[PDB]
Amino acid sequence: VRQSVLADCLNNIVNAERRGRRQVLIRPSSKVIVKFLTVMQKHGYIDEFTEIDDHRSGKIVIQLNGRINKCGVISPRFNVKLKDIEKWVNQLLPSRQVGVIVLTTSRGIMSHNEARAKDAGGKILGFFY
Amino acid sequence: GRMHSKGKGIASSALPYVRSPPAWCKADADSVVEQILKFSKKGMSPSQIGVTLRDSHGIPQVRFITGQKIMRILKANGLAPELPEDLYNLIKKAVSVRKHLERNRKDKDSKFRLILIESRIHRLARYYRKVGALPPTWKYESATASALVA
């Protein structure tokens, strides 16, 4: 049984990027996936993506523009405080300037840098770079 | 994956994107309800009647026209069976296997199949008890399984 659709979406994206394909199809769709895709698209790692709206959970077609080395999920979603962001960045991110950690804080789903600016922690969703 | 098998079949039905009755199908949303009530008065299965309206009557998915499910329509009209359809069918199959087992004493494969059916019927009964579709005290009985099916 599908335990987390976000893991499947990110695994499909990274698999397509390794294969070199410029488009990828993700099934099913969810608000968490849409928020995650918005975060990486705002950061510039993801081109336009269209949500096919059938009478089901939905499907997403994403245009991949390269410049992604690895995108993954952190399961289980550990609760991350303000002081734990540095530890997570050191553990996951390649450096202090490259890579993004996505946290579902109280103010919504956003990057670790934006959450640090918000001065609010939350739960770790995943990472991409 | 299959609940009690190694198969991975995906055969199902793909409901159309449209949610409206066909142009010529002027089912008027009340003659169908009367037909469903008549088909339930005899005591046919809700799935079986829905098949009959799909094939013989030519009616589309009944929800798209009547606005309510087959189970919901008959429950609203009062023709609600004492037990759910899947619950009753599994008890029927379990009763038949036990009646075959009491005659054929050397069928270990049938005994194993009966054990699988007993596991399935208990899990379904537990779900229905939790959801409240049945009285809280609905302990399944092996000796009175004939009572439960009929």
Partner: protein, 142 residues
Amino acid sequence: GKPAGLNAARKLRNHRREERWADAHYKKRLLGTAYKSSPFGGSSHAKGIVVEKIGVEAKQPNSAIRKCVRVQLIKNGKKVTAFVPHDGCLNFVDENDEVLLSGFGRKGKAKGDIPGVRFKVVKVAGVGLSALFHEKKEKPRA
């Protein structure tokens, strides 16, 4: 593989505790072998009473007489073996000399080609070693 649930701490802790006994280091440290089965009681050094001297044969590929000594511990009375570092001092170390023993380095394993030796003489008769070989200090009268 291993469970990765947010509430799987009990399962992870129980598995780690159960499997921790497989390691020899943890098993030794928690079974108290350094006190019960060991000739000492975790002591770094101890005193003993000499019993005799043995020229234990050397295993392959060597063959030698290592002039080791059989000693009886003062605190327990058990009989163990000891090694003499300096050369030709067998005449110097006699029996019932109130010898002082310490370990060898492998924390309870035989050294080199001589099986059954884990302790070496540090001091003998209270005069110590490294002096009776250079004739810096002589043995006292007994």
